[PDB]
With several copies, the nearest count.
Chain A
């Protein structure tokens, strides 16, 4: 798996590969690892497929549960604390193979600057968390390759479009060096999923756009 997230002016983008494995055997080609968890929040999750999806589902239901009970949505800080508590609660299982390791991308509607309000929060398997100040982050078996790529490409991020390009090309490098990360499948037409979040909320990025960017990177390299 590789999940990536990066801040661009006025928003954030998150993108994830589509591969599921059991050992060396490819068990899924089209899984979704990135979820809009509320109007201003997406979570990408690496680890055991069942635990990952369960985390995303439970987390979204929890944030909306609070919102409907109390009339207002949790602060961004609270949303973090609830995800972190979920991870910590799963540590015992994670040591026995049922691992969920999330990455949070949000837009903080309460922040001062509507151009730097995008938020990227990384987590560790004990629920420790850190709000990423350097602009990008990634998680999963391919996350080192993705981060070392974005280290070089991040100066090219100037808007949502270029940021999504760098995100998909990070996912590409991840796939190039990690067999547990799926690359763009031009034959089948399966591509990484991506969400972009700005002041207008979190939105799913149309597949056709990610396909375009993938074909442009592929052509570039050859």
Chain B
């Protein structure tokens, strides 16, 4: 029993440790996702729902399976009730249940770490919410930032000394890429997006290409 679960835990951890790292932090305009991703078309950050965003680390097919399941959950609940009943807390909760089931019952555990974020609805005053779901269904409520994958202690500490609330978009971005480096890196090796509390309905936005370049400098 306990040996099986220690093995599953280790296989998973070693999976996530060997993955490229990801950071999502609260900033003045909402929440920022910055991910080490050289791919041209395969994405690790994603929209879940109107004000709810998603980012993961680990094995791509597994956390993409989870992203898709989450979009299914969100759209279904929004339809059967109302759009405004879909919340980040809910999706973190279902991811917790889903990953716990996966971790105890599936042939192999998912080598995955997940971050669900929510910003306020348009015109409302509400602190952004970050949640981290680890491979075994553990769920953590985080106030300022979330760090996932690779070697996290360096990046988390970098942020812990450089993170300041109400940061602007460029400041927050540079703090995030700086923390990532502690673990040369520009448009071609980054996937960036934001939950932008200023947009009226769909808050998820990718910042790519000329825009991202402009913001890095």
A–B touch (CB < 8 A): the answer is yes
Q: Which chain A residues have a beta carbon within 8 Å of chain B's beta carbons?
A: 57-58, 61, 64-66, 68-72, 74-75, 77-78, 80-82, 85
- Interface residues of chain A: helix, strand, loop or mixed (majority): helix
CA distance in complex: A65, B47 (Å): 11
Residues in chain B near residue A71, CB distance under 8 A: 41, 43, 46, 89
Q: Which residue of A lies closest to B204 (CB)?
A: A68
Contact: A82 with B75, CB < 8 Å? no
Residues in chain B near residue A72, CB distance under 8 A: 87
Contact: B82 with A75, CB < 8 Å? yes
Q: Which chain B residues have a beta carbon within 8 Å of chain A's beta carbons?
A: 41, 43, 46-48, 68, 71, 75, 78-85, 87, 89-90
Q: How many A-B residue pairs have CB under 8 A?
A: 46
Which of B41, B68, B78, B79 interacts with A69 by CB under 8 Å? B68
Distance from A214 Cβ to chain B, minimum over Cβ atoms (Å) = 28
CA distance in complex: A91, B78 (Å): 23
Residues in chain A near residue B78, CB distance under 8 A: 61
Residues in chain A near residue B43, CB distance under 8 A: 71
Residues in chain B near residue A69, CB distance under 8 A: 68, 71
With A68-B46, A68-B47, A68-B48 known as contacts, the answer to whether A74 contacts B82 (CB < 8 A) is: yes
Contact: B85 with A78, CB < 8 Å? yes
Which of A57, A61, A65, A78 interacts with B81 by CB under 8 Å? A78
Distance from A76 Cβ to chain B, minimum over Cβ atoms (Å) = 8
Contact: B75 with A65, CB < 8 Å? yes
